[PDB]
Amino acid sequence: ILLRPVDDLELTVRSANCLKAEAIHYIGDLVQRTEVELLKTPNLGKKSLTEIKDVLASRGLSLGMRLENW
Amino acid sequence: YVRVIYQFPDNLWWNEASNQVYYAQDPMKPERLIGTPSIMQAKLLKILCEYHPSPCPNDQIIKALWPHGFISSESLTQAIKRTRDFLNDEHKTLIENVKLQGYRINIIQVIV
Amino acid sequence: VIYQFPDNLWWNEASNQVYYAQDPMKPERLIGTPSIMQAKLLKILCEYHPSPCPNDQIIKALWPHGFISSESLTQAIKRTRDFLNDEHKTLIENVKLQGYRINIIQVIV
Amino acid sequence: MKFILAEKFTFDPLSNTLIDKEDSEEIIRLGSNESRILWLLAQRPNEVISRNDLHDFVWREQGFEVDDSSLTQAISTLRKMLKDSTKSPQYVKTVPKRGYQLIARVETVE
Numbered sequence: 155i156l157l158r159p160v161d162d163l164e165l166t167v168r169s170a171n172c173l174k175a176e177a178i179h180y181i182g183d184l185v186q187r188t189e190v191e192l193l194k195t196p197n198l199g200k201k202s203l204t205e206i207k208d209v210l211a212s213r214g215l216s217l218g219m220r221l222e223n224w
Numbered sequence: 225y226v227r228v229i230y231q232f233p234d235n236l237w238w239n240e241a242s243n244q245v246y247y248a249q250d251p252m253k254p255e256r257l258i259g260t261p262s263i264m265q266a267k268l269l270k271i272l273c274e275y276h277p278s279p280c281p282n283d284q285i286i287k288a289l290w291p292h293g294f295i296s297s298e299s300l301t302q303a304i305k306r307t308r309d310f311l312n313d314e315h316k317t318l319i320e321n322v323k324l325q326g327y328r329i330n331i332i333q334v335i336v
Numbered sequence: 337v338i339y340q341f342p343d344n345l346w347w348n349e350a351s352n353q354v355y356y357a358q359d360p361m362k363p364e365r366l367i368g369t370p371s372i373m374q375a376k377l378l379k380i381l382c383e384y385h386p387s388p389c390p391n392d393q394i395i396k397a398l399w400p401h402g403f404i405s406s407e408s409l410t411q412a413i414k415r416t417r418d419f420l421n422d423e424h425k426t427l428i429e430n431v432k433l434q435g436y437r438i439n440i441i442q443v444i445v
Numbered sequence: 446m447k448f449i450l451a452e453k454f455t456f457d458p459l460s461n462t463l464i465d466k467e468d469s470e471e472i473i474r475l476g477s478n479e480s481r482i483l484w485l486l487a488q489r490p491n492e493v494i495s496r497n498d499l500h501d502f503v504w505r506e507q508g509f510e511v512d513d514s515s516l517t518q519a520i521s522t523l524r525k526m527l528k529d530s531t532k533s534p535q536y537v538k539t540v541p542k543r544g545y546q547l548i549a550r551v552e553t554v555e
Contacts, residue, residue, distance in 0.1 A: 171294040242387040243434070260388055260431045351492045366548070369493060369540050 155213045156182050163209055172197050184210075185219035192217075229335040230273060232318060236311070238269065245311065258312070264289055265307045272319065272329035279322040338444035339382050341427055345420065347378060354420065360444050367419070373398055374416050381428065381438035388435040448487050449552035451536060454527070458484040463527075478503065478515075479523040486537070486547040495544045520545065 160179055161170060176195060178184055184192075184206075192203060210216050230238040235248035243266060247256035261269065271280055271288050286300055304327065308319050320328045337349040338360045347354050350361065352375070357364035370378060380397050381389055395404050398412070413436060417428050428438050447457045454473075455464040461480040463473035475483075481503050486494065500516045520539070523529075529536040536549040 167296070171296070174294045175292050244386060254386075260434065260437070262431075263433055353491070353493075363491060366534075368534070369543065369546065372542060 155215055156180070156185070160184065165209065166202075166205070168197065169202055169206060181210075181215060182221070182224075185215060185217060186221050187217070189217060227336060230331050231333045231335065233330050233332060236318070258310070261307070261310065264303060265310065268303060268307055269329070272327060273331065276329065276331060279326040279328050281326045285327065340441035340444075341420070342439050342441065343427070345427070347382070367421075370416070370419060373412065374419065377412060377416055378438070381436060382440060384435075385438060385440045388431050388437045390435045394436065447554035448484075449550070449554060450487070451549035452552065454549070455554070456480070456483065456487075458487075473526060475526060476519070476522065479519045479526075482516075482519055483523060483537075483547075486545065487551055490551045491547060493540055493544045493546055499545060 158181060160173055160181065163170075163181075165173070172195065173184075178187065189203070192198060192206075193200070207217060225241065228240045230240070232238065235251070236245065237248055237252065237254070238245045243260055245258045245261060246254050247258060248254070249256045267289055268285065271285055282297070282300060286295060286297075289295075289300075289303065304319060304321075308316070311318050313319060318330055320330060322328050339347045339349075340360075341347065344356055344358055345354070346357050346360060348361070351363075353363070353369045354367040355363050355365055356367065369375075376398055377394065380394055384393070391409065395409060413428065417425070420427050422428055426439070428436060430436055447455060449455050453466055455466070456462065456475075458480070461475055461477060463475055465471065465473060482499065485499055485502060496513070496516060500513060504511055504515070520537070524531075524537055527536060534546070534548055536547065538546045538548065540546050
């Protein structure tokens, strides 16, 4: 699922309002958005990164995706 | 230095240089120190001071507190609540909620 | 110059030592003498009084040419309060993301 | 001018004598170096003096240079003969990296 807006991720209000500021609107950014850079962002800890990765894993996706052109 | 000191009802004093808020147990004698606000309490206080005496609309308050944030209005309400709590304003006179027009801060005088 | 602190504490610049006194210049209930770094920290916190003292100011005044591991900031201002016996964490206050401050009652010059 | 230390001992910088009030019959004899060190400490009441500065003031006026173990030995003899505490801060103590300290009170007789 690389064709959905991030708001369709069923993300909680905290994660949605955080990731909205980083101009991250499609999963294609997030699948290669590195774990470290995701952790550096304001208001995003390990226990929320866990749920982000869990929602990704439910729909096949995950972080750490070497990828292709746009 | 451009020093600005704000006098609030119940002889409250807010010193901008030291960023300190204290009760005056005399006309202007500092001995009863309420303390130092955080970096949004001070920001919202600055917003309400810069728009005095006009009420400040909530959208600009949010855009100044959160320049690049999709922050819900609940955080606005509770930020105002906590700022009024730490200023001991249980009677809602210090930071008044202008009905359907935003917020004002009750300030008597400015000392430079 | 004599700085007064809660619990009737005094730090002296007419001398170089700390004590618990009710008489400014009289050495009552001596604590001792802080170290070089401790004395510098106390001087910085007393000079920034009554304003909070920024963390970067403290690190570049105590360690102008040191690669501080960012955790000596807390060990130093832990043992400094311990040497002043701040068990209740009331003698030196930490306002988060703004800095440190030290509670000074009066200044004698 | 005679000095009184801690309301107990009496000492003069000019004749190098020590008198204990508890035992006024027994005069305490001190060496010149330790006596001059204690007098230099008394000249600056209760603030830190540097080991380097005290050492150079005590021994360069003497006209001769000695190593820094000499100051440590002189202070050891001073603490021993005064019967000051071995490591507690009662009369004289050492502040590391800063110098030497006196605790005994200063009372100028005249």
